[PDB]
Every structure is written in structure tokens, then in C-alpha cells.
Design a protein around this ligand. Structure first.
Ligand SMILES: Nc1ncnc2c1ncn2[C@@H]1O[C@H](COP(=O)(O)O)[C@@H](O)[C@H]1O
Ligand SMILES: Nc1ncnc2c1ncn2[C@@H]1O[C@H](COP(=O)(O)O)[C@@H](O)[C@H]1O
Ligand SMILES: [Cl-]
Ligand SMILES: [Cl-]
Ligand code: NA
Ligand code: NA
Ligand code: NA
Ligand code: NA
Lengths: 179, 179
């Protein structure tokens, strides 16, 4: 039933060793996207999960996050709001910066697209360190939105992101997990 | 019926003057994405249009193209294949470079994701000069795929892209047009 669907999704994901550099096992969701069965099931399962949750908006980060969050938004009948790298959004934004191993990056959101009252689901392709999602959550909360759920296709629990998101009050759901 | 749906889509799109620089009228699809009615109708109309076309794959370019092509792919029950900026795809790629006003850029696709026989629909947010779509088409055709249709939310016919795509043998369909 679901174990079989979850397995077919997991099997559809390819692993590319040593990309982008030696040691990393890259989990490639493009092999899932190209399999209509695996892709459609992914969206079904993520949106099923929040069907009674009261969600009013879905937020996904650029660019692979768009591929899972916008279809979940359409499946729930709610608007989709992107969080982008800087200088890509044309109306008024706020921004949040997040530490990387070396250096910092920044994400932005349209100030008009979240307002007090909104219940927001974050959806992304993959949870690693959690830094992007932590910055996204702070963006949505600055704008009065309530977020307590982030959903992913893939969780890499060894990298600590779930743990970090837990400390921000976010519950994470992932379809599959790799070690 | 449809004139009313097309109008509601057009009205949902905001225009930001002088972004990213003076003179440009930026057409912002994020106001459409945040309106579940306008977003859902957009995808309905694009996928309706190709419902009897024999499509086996949809190709969309990063990043806003993902927001329209992947939902069309799911609506047609076909796989979605991204075309990306360089160094973002992990398996074997080919690439195409395209002239910009100043300088050049490049797009890549996974060689395994298109093969002879595939009938490919390209879907993007907006048609301006046509340079990205021309490079995408050459990528898909190098891999044995047949493409004669590109679909957009928005066409800016003054910028010449439709004309250029016509000369590559591509038929373009857009929901709306601005001047
Ligand atoms: N091993 C990996 N395989 C594929 N993508 C990854 C991997 N590690 C990190 N990523 C990507 O990096 C993004 C940012 O992750 P985070 O460190 O959770 O902010 C994720 O959403 C993935 O797109
Ligand atoms: N006036 C505009 N408003 C919004 N986006 C634009 C505009 N002009 C160009 N673009 C974007 O530039 C991308 C590349 O367009 P092209 O020149 O057709 O390769 C489009 O797919 C749009 O995302
Ligand atoms: Cl800010
Ligand atoms: Cl090449
Ligand atoms: Na991501
Ligand atoms: Na707001
Ligand atoms: Na585009
Ligand atoms: Na191929």
C-alpha cells in the first residue's frame, strides 16, 4: 500500500557518489521527476499528509524546492510563495542571511505574500543542515505567518537539520531517508 | 468562459515598472502564483491545450520555468526534465550556450532524460527574446527528442522571441500578452 509507494519513490532516486565533491553521496531527485509515477506519488503523499492541517500558503525555496512545493500548493488549493536568492524578486522583500561552512548566503521573500493569520507549510526537496529552511522560517515568522510544518522528499538525518529545525519549533515530515 | 478565465489570469499578474532597470516593465508572475485560482487555471489551460498532442516529456528551464512546467507535466501524466544553469545537474549533461546582450550563458540537460522518440513540450513562464528557449530546443533535438511546441504564461511579442522560435520550427502558445 504505502510501503510499496514509498519504496518505488525511494528506488526512483539516484545516488551519485563524490558529487559535487569526494565523500558526498549526492541524492539526485531528477530521476524521480522524470518518472511520472514516482513524481505524482511524491506530491500525493506530501499533500495527503497535510490535507486536514488548515494550511493557507505553501512556501518553497529556489530552485529544486519549487518542484515540490508548487505542486503541493496546487494539490491543496492554496497559493505558492517562493523564497529566492537575492535580487530575483521584483516587489518589496525582506531578507535573512544564513551561515554556510564558508561564507554566508541570503534568502528573500515578498513582504506582501505572507500576512498575520497565514498558516504556512514549507516544502523542499531535501533536508541536510537545515540552514536554508531555518532562514525561510524566520522570514515567514517576521511577516506574521504561522509555520510549524516543513515537508521534504528526502531527509539526511546525519547532517543535523531535523534537530536544528526541532529547536525552532518545526515538525519535519520526509518521504524517505538516506544515511 | 475562457475569456473570463484568461482575463482573471492576466489581471493577477503585476507589472513593476523600471525593474530590474529603467525602461523595463517587469511582469511579475509571483502575484499569479500566490492566487490559487489564477495558478490552477494557468496550469489547466496550458495542459488542456496539449491534451491530445502525444506529449511524452515536459522540459522547463530554471527557475521560474519550473513553476509552470512541472505542474503541466503532472497534469499530463508525463515526466518532467529540468534544464539548468551549469554545474547544478549531477549526471552526464550536454550544454548549449546562447548570446545575451552582453556576454553569453549556458544551459545543460541530463543526456539520459531525453532519447529518440520522445515528444517534448517546452513550458516556461515568459517569452522575451527567445534565447533561452532556442538553446533548450537545440539541447532536446541533440538528444533525439522531437519538439515543436513551447508554451508560456506570458509572451512579449515586441522582443522578437516568437519570431525567432518560428525560424527553429517551434509553435508557441501563450495565455497572455503584454506590449
Ligand atoms: N547529499 C545531498 N544530495 C543532494 N542535495 C543535497 C545534498 N546535500 C545538500 N543538498 C541540497 O542542499 C540544499 C540546502 O540544504 P540545507 O543544508 O538543509 O540548507 C537542499 O535543499 C538540497 O537541495
Ligand atoms: N519584462 C520581463 N518581465 C519579467 N520577466 C522577464 C521580462 N523579460 C525577460 N524576462 C525573463 O527572462 C527570461 C528569459 O527570457 P528570453 O529573453 O525569452 O530568453 C524569461 O523566461 C523571463 O523569466
Ligand atoms: Cl530585511
Ligand atoms: Cl555538450
Ligand atoms: Na532545496
Ligand atoms: Na505581509
Ligand atoms: Na523563464
Ligand atoms: Na538520451
Amino acid at each position: 500500500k504505502t510501503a510499496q509507494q514509498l519504496k518505488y519513490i525511494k528506488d526512483s532516486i539516484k545516488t551519485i557518489p563524490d558529487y559535487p565533491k569526494a565523500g558526498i553521496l549526492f541524492r539526485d531527485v531528477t530521476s524521480l521527476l522524470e518518472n511520472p509515477k514516482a513524481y505524482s506519488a511524491s506530491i500525493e503523499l506530501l499533500s495527503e499528509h497535510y490535507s486536514e492541517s488548515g494550511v493557507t500558503k505553501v512556501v518553497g525555496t529556489e530552485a529544486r524546492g519549487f518542484l515540490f512545493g508548487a505542486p503541493v500548493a496546487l494539490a491543496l488549493g492554496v497559493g505558492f510563495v517562493p523564497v529566492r536568492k537575492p535580487g530575483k524578486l521584483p516587489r518589496e522583500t525582506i531578507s535573512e542571511s544564513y551561515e554556510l561552512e564558508y561564507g554566508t548566503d541570503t534568502l528573500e521573500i515578498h513582504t506582501d505574500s505572507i500576512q498575520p493569520g497565514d498558516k504556512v507549510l514549507v516544502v523542499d526537496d531535501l533536508l541536510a543542515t537545515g540552514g536554508t529552511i531555518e532562514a525561510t522560517v524566520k522570514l515567514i515568522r517576521r511577516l506574521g505567518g504561522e509555520v510549524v510544518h516543513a515537508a521534504f522528499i528526502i531527509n539526511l538525518p546525519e547532517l543535523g537539520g531535523e534537530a536544528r529545525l526541532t529547536q525552532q519549533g518545526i515538525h519535519c515530515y520526509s518521504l524517505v531517508s538516506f544515511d
